[PDB]
Assembly symmetry: C5
Homo-oligomer: 385 residues x 5
């Protein structure tokens, strides 16, 4: 007789698969688990879910599947289909849709009754995401493995291995994605929602950090590009009537661009992300450039103004060294029309050189409000790097 | 003999799982339920559905699964697979797609015949959404648990616990999302669509309110930004020929922006939301700014107009203090060409100072139609806060 | 003995569930159905499908499930699982994907053999949509219930109730959506695709009408907004050099807006919708405004033109009352250069006042081509309302 | 005894459903099929798939389900569940996802052993799409029905009916969609991937043609609209300084529009579609309009140029008839400043009339490069119509 | 007796399908596989997955399904349902969702016990994508077939055929898509995650290359189009006041276009793709064109400047040959006002001809920075072609 199916006839003849396998019912069946995390497939932030592929394994002690290796040609391990034995109902408290993993149809059984079960499982799980510092963020998502029905008296959950070996496990993990795990942190916890019920659970805090190197060329590269167009835009002469149309076109291009980057961050009501506050301050610096162009074109215009006041013309003089026959009465009438002509040219000429020395020094103030304000960026960048 | 599977052989030997378990058929099997709501996953408003994760439990009385704890070593609870016993067909009247929850394969049975069943269930349910006051809204969505086939004579539905304990249940609930539940309100109701049929149902009015703090920085922050660009835009001199091109560019940027925010609110035919009516009034204030610029550039232009009328020049004078040899005949011909030259300059100069004192006071009217109209915003904001 | 499972042992002992239950095989099993329509979930027009939630019920006569209420304690109704009896294969000819409804696991049986079956069913069904008059449209979608395999000799289909009661059934229906049903119209029809096969079917013409009140504020509110910007745009003086840049900017904004509304209507080759033809006529009215601005700026320009012809200057005069020492030769040379100077100013001044009296009356023609053309809108609106 | 389930007890008592039913194993079981195509649901071109709803039927000869109509009250047809008999594994070589069709749970059996099986089946099938002539295209997609495991020796595939009747079958087909089938073309073919294996297959070449009447109002209606704006745009005078800003705005609007229509056509590397080549030639005609405006504004400008050369002024004269006391020395100084003034006006006046007669004839060349080039469109349209 | 179901009664009478079929348990069951790849359906790069349709087959040796062809009329092959025998649990380590393939319900068995199993299987598999050289890229995605539970002692994996025949297999493969496979490379590998467990696996490195011919007309055709608009844009005279509005409009159109092409490439943190670095250098060349227009309009303007310095006027002269009665005092006053008039015209005239000879030679430098920089494109194109 072949000895490998003589054994399965001995185990599964009178085996009843609907009974929690134990001889004294007062003790629990202590399962023992661990995770080996393979990949982080996607982090959906607007929906606050997280899909993950995990290699997973359990063992528990089945007191009805015991034998001796003699009378069976020293068989010490054996494979049984999963649908023909008892199996616990351990699942996750935090799933959203779990139908993506196939069922492994086989389990091992040892000669002491140690049934061990290997299966892959994908987990579209719901964990709250903190998105405050957007390119430089670590996440803290839980994976609470628990028995759904059975209490402490029936099913208790411990680990396969030591909790140090779970923390530093990068044995299989797919790198060169968007995320990168630091550690998987296990913790036993006894859960109770009311009196007279207590449930075992095993949380796995998987922490991951975003690799930020892509988002420099999608959130900072056009923003610094829209600044060097603004720096060269002050070198238009304000008398052209084309400088204000330059600045409103630039702010138009900035405004369309900010729409594009708004859709990524979620509607989580803990506030705004920290980088999104900067694009408001980046946008308000364009308005100070837009309010500076309107002021000097209001100040310098062919409008037939009044005289420049010498109280400020002396103030502009100090800053200029810092930042820069009755035929006589008839023919007298024709020169008087030209007396008024060139003099009103010189009135607008007096307002003219005022609007350039206020153009230069306010361009220096704008250049120091950019160049000294960029040092604040790299020092917050280098320390958090 | 081990006593835990001796009991399951005693219960499930001649048990027929297709019969509603009762000895006198004239009495119903009164199930009893409650919900423990875990999260609100998404509220799709354009489709008017609502997905929700709920911890759920039932018990009913099975008169065929009774035993005595003696002859079984004082066993008082026991686990049976769900597919091997009777189970009611309680489901929801308002689902759209329910396939996302796994089946819990186990139930408890007590020694009196009290079968109790724990299961998670996700509910893409269809509830009508009222979206009138958009950032500040409470919702009222039903969850009508009922038996689909059985009538009052067969299955009646009551609650597990007191209806006060269901209302104030925040024991497990995931916060820091978009929504926040106030209460879950149960109510028994007897349903009847015709004569000779009556059905038990248990409605659960779950009310939730949106946390509005995110939508201030996505529906009010660019709208107030497009006003301070409009306030500074009046400081262009109207003689530039660049002011009307400024105002139409601004209204262009506003018009593109209103497209972006239109896609959120649904096509529900109860009317428009209340905040969407304000963006029309916000848009019509830009037209009054756009109609004011066209009027003064029509009024002030190098066009060789007629004289300003002294009926309104005196009216502008009052508001200015409030808001602000035959050689003689040949040579006489050359001055007359300059007589006509400077005089038509002074005609346009007379229309010139009119268009600035009407520019200033209409800018004060526009500034008071903004600043006093913003007080209406925060008082409606603070009371509803 | 308990009498409720003594009955199910009597019915389902030798019952064979694979046989169409009848004693004389020459007669059909006449099923009888009706629908109770609950909601219209979505109408996808680009794909021409329609999803609908329907409460549904059948009964047929099973000649093998008969008993007498005596010997069973006057039991007259009983519940049997659906998978343990015969059930017809009645389904829809027009489905696209039907997997969204759960299976009701129970049926009633009466003491005469009247098995009745209640189930919900969702129907992503394919019906052709007529989209000609877009906001004001009724639809006519079929729901052809038929047996897929069995012919007239085996399965015939009739109704539960009278066909008048199906038509006026609004007992349960979720209102305050986008659609609103007028009636559900049943009609028996015998189907035959060839010789020697005839099939019963029961069509249900469900007609629904769109509530159009939302699409007034998404298809007419910006279109009338882009007209009042065009009406005020004629009050620019044509000498500014900023009026043509105003009109092309407006047509730019209109052109981008028409892209946004194009994606809703499908690629159904019965033609264009009727409202989409109007937006072409709405767009061509902007070109007549754009061709009118180009004509007067071509007519009025500092170009050193020729004289205005008195054949049309008299025509403009009639419409103006309707719509509105050798020192002498040397010094004679300097006045002749000013003779040519002011005269060519008066030549452009003669073309100047022509271009305003043609500006005013063509603005009246444009104002009457708008105001009288809007009366055509509301009269087609009020009658179809 | 009722005779309809006495027959099913006679057929399915010792019937083994895992054996290919034949008495001499050396002959094949010749199935016979046909398709009745109901609708073409969608053609996804970027993914190159095709979903189709097909009414489908098979018959094969089962030598174990034979009887005589006597001893059974002249029963000649009978219904058996599909899961209780043998059924071939005929499926499609070209599917992508086939889970959308329900299983018909019944088959007919005749008294000779002719089992016939009716089922609907939806087919998201993968066929390569040729998209060269985009609005006027026929497709040629295969549907290769074959047995997946069994060879020629076990399962052979023929047709139900004559192959002429399959070709001209429009008995049920949903029209008024986007597509329209010409014919379904069957062809038997013996498949072999290596030595010692040969497989029967039955290809069904379904050819469909797009109804092009919708895409005239979405690919040609705005393109001809952006030409009549270009035709009227030449009537701006080139001295305005607003004509180049008109032409770049138009090319901006064209460039945004071409983005919108690019997303439809796939990334199939057989080249570009033929209509997409025309929009490049449509775009390059705008550049010749844009290069013509830049040339005449470079030629006509207040720049203090040199003299016009009489070598080309005579050439412009020919085309103009085709396409169109020491007081004397002091006072002599003041006329010499006006000698230089009006003469440089006449130098720019000489370049002025040159730039209009080159404006008119190059506008005639552009008008003949449009009007004669539109005749090429309708002749390629009418023949392919 | 018919001999084909007499054989299946002999094999499957006492067959236990839950036992790994072997007589001596110490030897493994060596399965043997290969793949025949049919199509590459989609490559999702933002999600880094890959869907593939593969024809697949296995055989293993079943020691319990042996017979002799005599006593069964020389039957040497036979078909058994898959659910009635043992089958290994060979699956893929790298799947994401595998539910899209149907189950083939049949297997062959030979008279020696060689069970062979044919099935199609679709594989949304997760492989890391290298996207550095975007249009010209080869991919290297693994397909690791392994037994999930069984070790080396139970299941070992080898190939059907020689590993050379797998490499050059294009027998069935759907061409004329986006991708094109070079080879499928098999490699045996023994896997071990810890001590005391060793697993067989069979990697299949399928390498595919993108056909780049479509992306020339979607990533290079508008980019070279936005250069010839820039080349003709220098032929505007800088005195128009319309040239800077031309250049900012062009950069606006370029900036919107770069948004459109950004969404394809993923967020993989290995850096940026190589073609995306070029569009930054393509964008910075427009800024040098935009900084050149601002410089000459700052240099040439009616501003009443000072004199041009003869240190650079001589430098411009060298490059111009390379790149190009008390009535007397009263009447003396009127000429002095015209002395100042024409002289300040000649001051701006002196700056005028400077700004054209710097316009021409900087246009030659820009033309050589384009034409010589395009030779770098085609040489990198032709070698990698
Ligand atoms: C949600 O809506 C339901 C009905 O639409 C409200 O239920 C009503 O509650 C009042 C107060 O208890 C009862 O008098 C009515 O009989 C109830 N109506 C029905 C149809 O049962 C419910 O109060 C609403 N929720 C909130 C928070 O107001
Ligand atoms: C669709 O394509 C197939 C092949 O790609 C065409 O089938 C060919 O038809 C001709 C004419 O009957 C035969 O001579 C060839 O042998 C067929 N080819 C194959 C591979 O069998 C088919 O004709 C095409 N459809 C149309 C409408 O032309
Ligand atoms: N083929 C993968 C077998 C395997 C090896 N080590 C494992 C660890 C966990 C697990 O679920 C599975 C495994
Ligand atoms: N593991 C969660 C068990 C659990 C504890 N309390 C519960 C309440 C309801 C429920 O369905 C389930 C539970
Ligand atoms: N719980 C809903 C039971 C029900 C009451 N009336 C009905 C009518 C039809 C139907 O399918 C079902 C019903
Ligand atoms: N109810 C549709 C029955 C039917 C009638 N003719 C048919 C032809 C083919 C098929 O699969 C089915 C049919
Ligand atoms: N009908 C396809 C049968 C077939 C022929 N050759 C094959 C090779 C592999 C495979 O899985 C299947 C096949």
């Amino acid at each position: 007789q072949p000895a490998l199916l003589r054994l399965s006839d001995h185990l599964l003849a009178n085996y009843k698969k609907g009974v929690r396998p134990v001889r004294d019912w007062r003790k629990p069946t202590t399962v023992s688990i661990d995770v080996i995390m393979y990949a982080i497939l996607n982090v959906d932030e607007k929906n606050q879910v997280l899909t993950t592929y995990i290699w997973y394994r359990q063992y528990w002690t089945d007191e009805f599947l015991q034998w001796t290796p003699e009378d069976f040609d020293n068989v010490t391990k054996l494979s049984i289909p999963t649908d023909s034995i008892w199996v616990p109902d351990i699942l996750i408290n935090e799933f959203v849709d779990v139908g993506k993993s196939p069922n492994i149809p086989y389990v091992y059984v040892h000669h002491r009754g140690e049934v061990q079960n290997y299966k892959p499982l994908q987990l579209v799980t719901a964990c709250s995401l903190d998105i405050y510092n957007f390119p430089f963020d670590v996440q803290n998502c839980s994976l609470t493995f628990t028995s759904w029905l059975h209490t402490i008296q029936d099913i208790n959950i411990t680990l396969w291995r030591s909790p140090e070996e779970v923390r530093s496990d990068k044995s299989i993990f797919i790198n060169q994605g968007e995320w990168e795990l630091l550690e998987v942190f296990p913790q036993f916890k006894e859960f109770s929602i009311d009196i007279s019920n207590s449930y075992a659970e095993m949380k796995f805090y998987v922490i991951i950090r975003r690799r930020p190197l892509f988002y420099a060329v999608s959130l900072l590269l056009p923003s610094i590009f829209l600044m060097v167009v603004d720096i060269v835009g002050f070198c238009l002469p304000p008398d052209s009537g084309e400088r204000v149309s330059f600045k409103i076109t630039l702010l138009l291009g900035y405004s369309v661009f900010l729409i594009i980057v708004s859709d990524t961050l979620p509607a989580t009501a803990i506030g705004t992300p920290l980088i999104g506050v900067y694009f408001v301050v980046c946008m308000a610096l364009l308005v100070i450039s837009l309010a500076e162009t309107i002021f000097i074109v209001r100040l310098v215009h062919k409008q037939d103004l009044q005289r420049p006041v010498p109280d400020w013309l002396r103030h502009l003089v100090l800053d200029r060294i810092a930042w820069i026959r009755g035929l006589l009465q008839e023919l007298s009438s024709i020169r008087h029309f030209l007396e008024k002509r060139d003099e009103m040219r010189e009135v607008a000429r007096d307002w003219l050189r005022v609007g350039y020395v206020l153009d230069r020094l306010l361009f220096r103030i704008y250049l120091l409000a950019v160049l000294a304000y960029s040092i604040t960026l790299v020092t917050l960048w280098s320390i958090w790097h």
